[PDB]
Amino acid sequence: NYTFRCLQMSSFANRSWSRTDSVVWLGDLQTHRWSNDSATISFTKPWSQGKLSNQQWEKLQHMFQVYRVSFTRDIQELVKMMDYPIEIQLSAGCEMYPGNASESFLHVAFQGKYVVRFWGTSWQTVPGAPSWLDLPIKVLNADQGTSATVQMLLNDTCPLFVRGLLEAGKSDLEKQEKPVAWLSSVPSSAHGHRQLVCHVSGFYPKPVWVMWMRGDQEQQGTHRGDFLPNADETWYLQATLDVEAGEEAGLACRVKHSSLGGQDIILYW
Amino acid sequence: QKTPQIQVYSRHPPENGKPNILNCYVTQFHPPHIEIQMLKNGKKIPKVEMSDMSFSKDWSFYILAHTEFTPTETDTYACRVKHASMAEPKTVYWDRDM
Ligand SMILES: CCCCCCCCCCCC(=O)N[C@@H](CO[C@H]1O[C@H](CO)[C@H](O)[C@H](O)[C@H]1O)[C@H](O)[C@H](O)CCCC(=O)NCCCCCCc1ccccc1
Ligand SMILES: *[C@@H]1O[C@H](CO[C@@H]2O[C@@H](C)[C@@H](O)[C@@H](O)[C@@H]2O)[C@@H](O[C@@H]2O[C@H](CO)[C@@H](O)[C@H](O)[C@H]2NC(C)=O)[C@H](O)[C@H]1NC(C)=O
Ligand SMILES: CCCCCCCCCCCCCCCC(=O)O
Ligand SMILES: *[C@@H]1O[C@H](CO)[C@@H](O)[C@H](O)[C@H]1NC(C)=O
Ligand SMILES: *[C@@H]1O[C@H](CO)[C@@H](O)[C@H](O)[C@H]1NC(C)=O
């Protein structure tokens, strides 16, 4: 069960300066990058072409090459009619559900706020979006050639492409990397208290279980941090526990993960 | 405008004298223009590698910086961020214990 996301980020500083950059993700692994200063889309995995032939890939890329130029012109022309600086983001792709099913999306943000989506056969402003967008969305919807292309991309190309990625990238998507854990501590705010920290790093895939323990008893004070990326496509997480000084003894951190073969890591404080 | 959050953490368990990698993960910011420096004893580390900038479900940007480092008993490491949301740079120190 995976979500394929193409993320476009465009900054328009004035009528002479703009750039558009994109990154593409399959779940939590980056599959493409497309820098403003590259003519072509870059692969960031060996399998980033999926099961598309070189001809199909080149066709697909050419359309994006045209889009990137047209997009930039459209926005510059729009700002002249209607100011700077302007940030526009697009998030498009599809979510693959079990038994062949999938749903596609194309969402657009202006100045960091979701304003427009493509839905069915047309562009729509979302409720609460500024009313000045209605007219340019009307004009965009008159372009039926663009509408039909976006329909093809969302309905056909996205799920097709992603099926091929899942097959082609199987050994990477299903890779297992073991967490390594360690313990440390800092003083707490209030007197006679300490924050114990269980650090867990290098694990893949993302799902993991980390708890402070007293024997078989979970310590419900366990405060799990956010999932933080390492630079080598593994994850980092820490879990903290506020403890009274001289109540440290008998505490352990326990880590469960798919890569460990049913043998949890247990570190003792 | 959204203010960047900064988290500093090592790739491997720190051991004094042993080469490791220090990560600085910067999140929750907008607009995307940003300057990120990693510092050793207050001095800019030259070799710093950056991921491609990306953004989250909520549209805020994130980026990961990392560099090789060898922790010792006496060296301090930090990550310093300049962004239009803040009048001054924000510095977060690596604390192996935190
Ligand atoms: C993340 C992935 C990107 C998803 C995106 C779709 C990629 C496929 C497009 C292929 C067709 C396209 O490029 N159309 C371009 C070229 O069109 C000509 O040529 C085409 C073929 O070459 C067809 O023959 C057309 O009939 C013909 O008019 C159009 O010039 C098109 O108008 C440019 C792209 C417009 C577009 O979609 N923009 C993103 C949506 C933003 C909506 C407005 C948002 C906004 C506005 C102001 C302020 C803030 C926000
Ligand atoms: C493409 O599919 C849409 C419907 O799919 C939905 O919208 C897409 C953008 C995508 O995000 C999907 O996951 C969504 O579930 C078709 O639009 C429908 O067409 C039917 C049949 O003519 C019509 O009765 C409906 O009104 C349309 N649905 C909506 C919600 O507007 C569209 O025709 C398909 N286009 C092609 C070329 O296949
Ligand atoms: C409408 C987009 C969904 C369909 C995408 C299926 C093909 C994926 C190809 C990956 C290349 C990414 C190109 C990014 C283009 C951009 O955002 O400007
Ligand atoms: C346009 O923006 C760029 C980048 O911010 C800047 O260097 C340049 O001064 C701007 N151009 C004008 C004409 O102000
Ligand atoms: C981005 O790419 C476009 C098209 O190649 C180019 O004209 C523009 O100058 C680039 N922008 C920057 C800021 O480099």
Curated annotation (Swiss-Prot), chain B:
Localization per record: Secreted
Main location: secreted
GO biological process: amyloid fibril formation; antigen processing and presentation of endogenous peptide antigen via MHC class I; antigen processing and presentation of exogenous protein antigen via MHC class Ib, TAP-dependent; cellular defense response; cellular response to iron(III) ion; cellular response to nicotine; intracellular iron ion homeostasis; iron ion transport
Effect upon mutating residue 84 to V: In allele W2, W4 and W5
Keywords, ordered alphabetically: Disulfide bond, Immunity, Immunoglobulin domain, MHC I, Secreted, Signal
A GO MF term: structural molecule activity
Cellular component terms (Gene Ontology): cytosol; external side of plasma membrane; extracellular space; Golgi apparatus; HFE-transferrin receptor complex; MHC class I peptide loading complex; MHC class I protein complex; phagocytic vesicle membrane
Cysteines joined through disulfide linkages: 24-79
Residue ranges annotated for the Ig-like C1-type domain, each copy included: 4-93
Function according to Swiss-Prot or TrEMBL: Component of the class I major histocompatibility complex (MHC). Involved in the presentation of peptide antigens to the immune system.
Description of how the protein assembles with itself and partners: Heterodimer of an alpha chain and a beta chain. Beta-2-microglobulin is the beta-chain of major histocompatibility complex class I molecules. Forms a heterotrimer with MR1 and a metabolite antigen.
Protein family: Belongs to the beta-2-microglobulin family.
UniProt-recorded name of the protein: Beta-2-microglobulin
Organism the protein comes from: Mus musculus (Mouse)
Protein's gene: B2m
